[PDB]
Amino acid sequence: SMTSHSWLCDGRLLCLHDPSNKNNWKIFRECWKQGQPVLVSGVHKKLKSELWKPEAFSQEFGDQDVDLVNCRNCAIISDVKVRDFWDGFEIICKRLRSEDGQPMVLKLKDWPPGEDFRDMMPTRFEDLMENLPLPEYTKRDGRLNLASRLPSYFVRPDLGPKMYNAYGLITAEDRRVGTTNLHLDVSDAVNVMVYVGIPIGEGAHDEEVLKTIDEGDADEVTKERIHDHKEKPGALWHIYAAKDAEKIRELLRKVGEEQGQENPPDHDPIHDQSWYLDQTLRKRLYEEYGVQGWAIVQFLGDAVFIPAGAPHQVHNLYSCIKVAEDFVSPEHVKHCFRLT
Ligand SMILES: O=C(O)c1ccncc1
Ligand SMILES: [Cl-]
Ligand SMILES: [Cl-]
Ligand SMILES: [Cl-]
Ligand SMILES: [Cl-]
Ligand SMILES: [Mn+2]
């Protein structure tokens, strides 16, 4: 039967089932006030699916100049055409290659650039903004979005949305690597998976995806979404409570020292955005510091709600297109205040 919601992460994570249910807020707000992330499924079914394909982005915008990042080693690939990224999104043998002759796992950096998303893509913008879940929190003018309502004593988010476009990580070695390293944001965000590209060429990569999710510490209810409903999984997230950030900094300072980094006792390994917590570091965080995370698999059409100040990392399993809107909820407004 259709239900309003379910739980993932053994009851620690709310999953809302209907993105346009006008009563979602009553369930949402109790979980959110406690600083938990929230998942809303089914957003893809509300969108104009033809607007969110990699072929359309290449055809319409292929001639713009951009930089990419090699996810395996962090190297910048400078001043290439945005078609060089998109045409290899799903066809492996079209990807830029590294010195070793392997097809590279790439991230498109800052595209569309800064705040130009609405000017460059006004139909996409309309399609996203009209279908975001919890609209009183997430729309630019929502009754519970304080973004446009706060003085300069608060850090206000840039006008979005932001696009996050990147290939999936492939091999056993890539299991220890991030699409996006551990970092925190001073605003709230809703991040929506609008497209998951399962490749072809080396299209027999189904089994390393299960070992990544398994070793990623994903729950049994989450593994059932693959094997029973055949939903497409895009990315593996780890998110931590805002209250645990300083314990995460102490660990990463200790591990820096152990690896002979030379860093002042004050420097911020979260703000550096230089760490991905692999199974070894996540186990050590739990055991030595008492800190437990939420391991979240974002499928096509899942919306991930990210509490302000909450450290998070993402590991794309397959090539992903996602779009995120920043907002400022009353529940978390402390995290963007500039005093005390
Ligand atoms: O690459 C992502 O998916 C991402 C980047 C930054 N914050 C959240 C998610
Ligand atoms: Cl558009
Ligand atoms: Cl709402
Ligand atoms: Cl990063
Ligand atoms: Cl908080
Ligand atoms: Mn982020």
Q: Which residues contact 95 (CB under 8 A, 6 or more apart)?
A: 88, 103, 104, 106, 167
Q: Which residues pair with 303 in a beta bridge?
A: 40, 192
Instruction: Say how far residue 46 (Cα) sits from the centre of its chain.
Output: 20
DSSP letter string, 200-252:
BSS---HHHHHHHHHHTT--HHHHHHHHTT---EEEEEEE--GGGHHHHHHHH
The residues spanned by each domain of the chain are 1-340
CA gap 29, 247 in Å, rounded:
26
- Ligand 1 centroid to Cα of residue 205, in Å, is 23
CA gap 142, 129 in Å, rounded:
11
**CB of 338 closer than 8 Å to CB of 76:** no
Resolution (A): 2.0
- Ligand 5 centroid to Cα of residue 231, in Å, is 32
So what's the architecture of 1-340 in CATH? Sandwich (2.60)
In this structure, what DSSP letter does residue 121 have? -
- The continuous run of DSSP H or E covering 253 comes out as helix 245-258
CA gap 332, 310 in Å, rounded:
10
CA gap 282, 297 in Å, rounded:
16
Taking the CA of 314 as reference, the closest ligand is 1
Mark the residues whose beta carbon lies below 5 A from ion ligand 5: 35, 242
CA gap 70, 87 in Å, rounded:
16
Q: Which residues contact 331 (CB under 8 A, 6 or more apart)?
A: 29, 32, 33
Tokens at 49, concatenated: 């699916």
Name which residue sits closest to atom 9 of ligand 1, judged by CA. 314
CA 147-48-112 angle, 5° bins: 50
Cβ 314 under 6 angstroms from ligand 1: yes
In this structure, what DSSP letter does residue 126 have? H
Cβ 180 under 6 angstroms from ligand 1: yes
Q: Which residues pair with 80 in a beta bridge?
A: 66
- The continuous run of DSSP H or E covering 13 comes out as strand 13-16
Cβ 179 under 6 angstroms from ligand 1: yes
**CB of 214 closer than 8 Å to CB of 293:** no
Is the bond preceding residue 151 a cis peptide, omega within 30 degrees?
Answer: no
CA dist list (Å): 261 to 123, 147, 278: 47, 38, 18
Tokens 């993105």 -> residue:
19
The helices-and-strands tally (H runs, E runs) of the chain is 10, 14
SS (H, E, C) 52-69: HCHHHHHHHHCCCEEEEE
- Ligand 4 centroid to Cα of residue 274, in Å, is 6
In this structure, what DSSP letter does residue 139 have? S
CA gap 228, 12 in Å, rounded:
22
Instruction: State the chain's maximal CA–CA distance in angstroms.
Output: 57
Torsion of the alpha carbons at 99, 316, 180 and 299, rounded to the nearest 10: 160
- Which 3 state secondary structure label does DSSP give 38? strand
| Strands, E assignment, 103-159 | 106-108
Other CB atoms within 10 A of residue 77 CB: 18
